[PDB]
């Protein structure tokens, strides 16, 4: 059938805007696959008092525009291929909204569902030794990532301090507030997202106030998004979690299911008649914002999407053949790379405020964001409309245009 | 041991109100590094001297370690100790990524010459060199200690690091990457906490009336930028006596016929006593340098809305238990005079970007400082309906204990 | 007509008339440190060319040096060292956290490749690299260096060093953590200092006639922005206000190190934030030396010798040099 | 009552030593305190889940001779003081024996026989980092000492090379020989003693074989000691733990107490019928050997020792007043500072085969250490002998003569 392969598909619309920008083959094959990718096993004792060993991933895609930024994620089906291309997007999304950034990323082949505070801390502290030769403040930067907290991040930034011998705060981002981290972190993503879908709602003359949206995914990003579209007068008539979907078309209480949630974002299963994720993705909208796993618009549903607007919150959540389906029926969509790009801005922040030592209050966290967030959203559709190509294809070229242009200034090519 | 032990309760008495367990005391109780050094140093006279050193770092959860190093014949290991641990309460109070440090060398500064305080000044360095610099412990001035021994200091790191590191050490010279709006930062951040709890308790400073103990350069200093502001000042003292005259007393002449000791009140015949003056009818009373001013013999007597401690401990702890019971706002020490660490803590941040701020941006970011941390420990105190300075000892040190729990430590 | 001797003359008159003892400038009348090095470079068809570079460092008591590198087959060491003093003298006009450096290579770049130049570069950066850095001393471009021989160097010490280091060197492009508004950085300071110097003299520019001599590149420009040793003091005697170069052309180092602040940071500024700083800091700059000019009633040449060499002075009497 | 304060009684001799060999009053300033004394609070995770805080030490005396050399000792009675004339002890062990190290030493305040192997391991590990940015292989370099071992010295040196980056195996001694230990390193102390007996033995005419000699103590150095002695045909009547002694004049069974000993040296639990410490220190012998602790031979015990040659195995075990009652008695005392000396020795060696990357087998360690501790009992007697004074003011004249010359090379000191 189609491609459902993360890495190739993100390589072949890379292949593309490099096309695109003019380059020529030696760039692609520069870009294709991250200049280092790093595998590691992690010895752990656990509470038992065996031993069990893991499998880490560190990816750095390109350091040609600055030190690479990326989270580690713990979960069992972290995959090689999977580290490798988010850490590409890593790159995208931060020449999208223009940071110092190259693209990284990191990831454990671990349950931690299945596993103790005591334990999770020893797995973290051992994965910045093992990886700690090519990471630090001015080399490389983590953050947080699928089931990976500030809590986490505090582990791993207090052993990258103890072997430095001092206080390294911007050796990873996502901590604590006492440890040097950033106000508006937790929002930051649906913040971006938010910024993001009022944009796309100006340009095709949807008015906010009483705008219909449904979102995949009661998460930290969706939930988060479902109270921001409700406090600006938008009727959120879709909402889903793992379990199922329930929909109201007159606008659900977001207040009343944020209030009785579940740690793990679940609220569906506290209700008789639930709708599922299949029917959800299909409801009629102004606006949908798939904010769950991936591939959740795939051809098969593609041109039963009744939304006018399309905002990919989580990593890709419609596959390549869909985006094209989803162009030619004239749907504004806005790639992940561009939606979820708040988390790296504040992010970068963060680090900025560890480089100085001096750290901002929200207002001003909040105010760089939305111009950051504004100006990228308007550089990838000015892009999309005026060359006629798809959101996706625009965004990577705003994306990878400062990798390879400072690639061909260093002579890297 | 006895201001140490004394300060070892302080951590205490705010740990437990916070809520944490005996192992967070037995980590804040005692720096985690205490290094005592012994340093060589030749004399003009072709002889060599050995000199004690101490640096005391209390605790970097929260960032590097920042105190000052003082040249005194008093200086002790629980001294050093005790008082790196007091620069750990001061930095959370106004909020810095810092921990407590603190160091202090046994010599005689009056009884040397430049050359062997310099020589003194670069083998200090030379023998703690191993546990400092601006990532990890920023010494700054103190007793006996001056912008010159800062920029003996500033040099012998950098020689040792083959480059300029000017973050190492504040205080130093404009021309050495010190900080503007550094001279009168302590003062000036008095007056703030003043302004601000004024305002808490809905007092118009234009016609407040305003109390002030003591008229040496610290007090004097007050005593105009409230007259200055248009407050009416009714009532100064100094070491022999008192001046108390109502609807304002005419600062400015004050300062006129004052003497080089900061002695006014040997020009007047008729004068009223100084424990009269801690009575007075005022808004606002700030005490003098001396302690154990306000104690309970006189603590029901107080007849002023707020209180603002300008002057290590010039209350008693039954005087507070006393002051707070009658509703009056008091102002600890260790808030009103954080405005010195705050300047100090810009120095340092201008020193990592290489990019210096102009005097009157130093004072605006100064405010806020002063502003945000008053605005904490008020509402620390309001919320726990305690007094104010065991809710400053809790502001202090929450940061500290959060970052040692989040980091394992405990 | 020696330009290291003139500008050893040009240091012991100001720090004269500073106040300061002959020991200062024994201290500052020579480079604390210069380093000479020869540099081996293949070539094009396959033969090696050896390379003598210079890498000058005139004082680091108030901070780094900052300089750059010209390419020029007149490339002297005379020529790098009194270079490197005229670097201490405008940071110090501008009040940068700076001292002076400056660096050359003898060698004709316009008889040599991409591939040669590049090569020469990188060769170069290896080979001082050992007293050169963010912290140290902080090269820029010259004569017939750019934004791509910036970029070699930067990508060098950065592989070098294992990690990106954009603020060891300046002049760099965009994309690698360059400034903006370092374009028009020393056009655009000329423009500030042809304003000042009008407020001075009570003149409104809109009423104000214009005439300029330049025939090269700034002066259409500077006409675009409108709509000697006895002659220095000929001026002065008829009350003309004179304004010297190293006072005139500081935007090129001010906003230089606007981009090495920025890379501090990894947090850069737009256009309008960096003319905005850049014209207090010649308009500063400008009233300094005139203040000076005026109040210690000398020639405006030598007053900005004065200001410019003060803070290094200053600095190296604080930190027990002399 | 007597000085009992082992910071202050060395500090007397070394200036008494100072004075002899004709320094000024500076040098003794200088060297009567270490250069650099960190105090560190360590915490710990226990295996319950809470969180107990330690306190640590590590002394560095002088570092004019080169990098600092010492042990971390893990005891409930470990105080600033003791380390600090721990610390001195060392720099006066490498003067004698001629190493190209200053003197240094650690301790933490806990107790092992309550604290399971992780804990044990998260306290070693705790203690490294607390202490990591003074400590390394070129500026001070850790080894075995009372409660420490092996195993103790490997946590150490894994957690100082994950901090690096790379393996630093000379940055810590008495490593396990796979991770880059030396040779006869485990039995160092004992053997060193051992030769110093024989020296001692031959000046006093006595035969090793059918020698009457006892040992207080049964740890690292005294239970080697006890088999060295009953291997070279002496008869070890004494023997003595933390708990007791056991004497029997025909020679104790050695290898029967070695085999039922606990992990950390006791056995004489085991029986019904044993003496106390101080009748085993008054035994009739030949040579008494204090290998147990501090301040066992003093004042009121001087007076009723009947060996003929005390050597001091253990630090400090007999005090300043019982150093004049000894030899005004012509008892041939050894000082701990000389006899003690193979432990830092065979370390010594450790080092150098972790510089190179390039080990020796046992004869080649065996052999450089015999010369060393054969050539320093020589020069300590002949000082002794020749100017007429006691073998430890001997021997802290000889182990002070290089760090107080390295001073005055480097312009620490006037003159």
Same mark, same amino acid.
């Given at each position: 059938a189609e491609n459902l392969n993360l890495f190739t598909s993100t390589q072949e619309v890379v292949k593309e805007a490099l096309n695109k920008l003019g380059y020529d083959e030696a760039m692609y094959e520069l870009l294709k696959e991250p200049l280092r990718l790093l595998k590691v096993r992690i010895p752990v004792k656990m509470d038992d008092g065996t031993t069990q060993v893991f499998t880490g991933y560190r990816a750095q895609h390109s350091d040609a525009v600055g030190p690479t930024k990326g989270g580690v994620r713990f979960h069992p089906m972290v995959s090689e291929d999977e580290v490798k291309a988010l850490s590409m997007w890593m790159t995208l999304k931060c020449g999208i909204v223009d940071l110092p950034y190259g693209g990284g990323k990191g990831g454990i082949i671990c349950d931690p569902r299945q596993m103790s505070m005591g334990e999770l801390e020893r797995l973290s502290r051992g994965y910045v030794r093992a990886i700690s030769q090519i990471v630090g403040p001015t080399k490389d930067i983590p953050g947080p990532d699928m089931f990976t907290n500030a809590q986490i991040m505090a582990w791993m930034m207090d052993e990258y301090s103890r072997m430095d011998e001092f206080n390294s705060p911007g050796f990873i981002t996502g901590k604590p507030l006492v440890l040097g981290g950033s106000k508006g972190r937790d929002r930051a993503t649906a913040e971006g997202?938010?910024?993001?879908?009022?944009?796309?709602?100006?340009?095709?003359?949807?008015?906010?106030?009483?705008?219909?949206?449904?979102?995949?995914?009661?998460? #930290?990003?969706?939930?988060?998004?479902?109270?921001?579209?409700?406090?600006?007068?938008?009727?959120?008539?879709?909402?889903?979690?793992?379990?199922?979907?329930? +929909?109201?078309?007159?606008?659900?209480?977001?207040?009343? =299911?944020?209030?009785?949630?579940?740690?793990?974002? !679940?609220?569906?299963?506290?209700?008789? #008649?639930?709708?599922?994720?299949?029917?959800?993705?299909? =409801?009629?909208?102004?606006?949908?914002?798939?904010?769950?796993?991936?591939?959740?618009?795939?051809?098969? #549903?593609? +041109? #039963?999407?009744?939304?006018?607007?399309?905002?990919? %919150?989580?990593?890709?959540?419609?596959?390549?053949?869909? !985006?094209?389906?989803? !162009?030619?029926?004239?749907?504004?969509?806005?790639?992940?790379?561009? %939606?979820?790009?708040?988390?790296?801005?504040?992010?970068?922040?963060?680090?900025?405020?560890?480089?100085?030592?001096?750290?901002?209050?929200?207002?001003?966290?909040?105010?760089? =964001?939305?111009?950051?967030?504004?100006?990228?959203?308007?550089a990838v559709y000015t892009t999309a409309t005026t060359r006629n190509i798809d959101m996706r294809l625009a965004a990577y070229m705003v994306g990878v245009r400062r990798t390879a242009e400072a690639s061909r200034f260093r002579g890297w090519v």
């Open positions: 997202v938010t910024i993001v879908i009022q944009e796309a709602a100006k340009k095709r003359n949807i008015d906010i106030k009483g705008a219909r949206v449904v979102i995949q995914g009661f998460g #930290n990003a969706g939930s988060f998004l479902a109270k921001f579209m409700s406090d600006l007068g938008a009727k959120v008539i879709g909402i889903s979690d793992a379990y199922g979907a329930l +929909h109201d078309p007159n606008g659900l209480d977001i207040d009343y =299911l944020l209030d009785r949630r579940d740690s793990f974002g !679940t609220v569906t299963t506290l209700f008789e #008649n639930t709708i599922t994720n299949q029917e959800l993705l299909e =409801l009629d909208c102004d606006i949908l914002v798939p904010a769950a796993i991936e591939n959740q618009i795939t051809a098969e #549903n593609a +041109h #039963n999407i009744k939304a006018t607007i399309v905002v990919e %919150a989580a990593n890709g959540p419609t596959t390549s053949e869909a !985006t094209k389906i989803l !162009t030619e029926r004239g749907i504004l969509l806005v790639p992940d790379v561009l %939606a979820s790009a708040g988390g790296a801005t504040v992010s970068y922040f963060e680090w900025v405020q560890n480089n100085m030592g001096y750290y901002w209050e929200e207002e001003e966290v909040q105010e760089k =964001l939305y111009k950051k967030m504004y100006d990228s959203f308007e």
